[PDB]
Design a protein around this ligand. Sequence first.
Ligand SMILES: CCOc1ccc(C(C)=O)cc1Nc1ccc2ccn(S(C)(=O)=O)c2c1
Length: 115
Amino acid sequence: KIFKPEELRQALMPTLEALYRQDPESLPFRQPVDPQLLGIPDYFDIVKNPMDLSTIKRKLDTGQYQEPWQYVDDVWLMFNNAWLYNRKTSRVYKFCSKLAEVFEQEIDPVMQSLG
Ligand SMILES: CCOc1ccc(C(C)=O)cc1Nc1ccc2ccn(S(C)(=O)=O)c2c1
């Protein structure tokens, strides 16, 4: 169908807020990765399309998603970047796995409502 920007914001923003509410797990995802500040200068050699919660929020607020699946794609891009870059024993990797569980749980009923 056609999804209006405010329809997408009302339906999808609560799912993003559910991720933001996760502490400690969302903290590494609340702002774009800053490789120099974090001391990980190889980051952009591995992650070609960075994504984080604040960028997704901005895209929702500025109507940059036409379809719900584009929002889901960006959330999963954020997750896949973190699993790609970080080691499986690291905080960010395990935090990512927790956020993916939370997101799966929240997005399902919302997608049912948007159908
Ligand atoms: C370990 C090098 O750091 C990272 C590496 C990779 C990635 C990504 C998103 O692939 C993010 C971080 N950043 C990060 C990590 C842990 C914590 C804990 C609190 N915070 S914080 C200051 O409250 O934001 C953290 C911020």
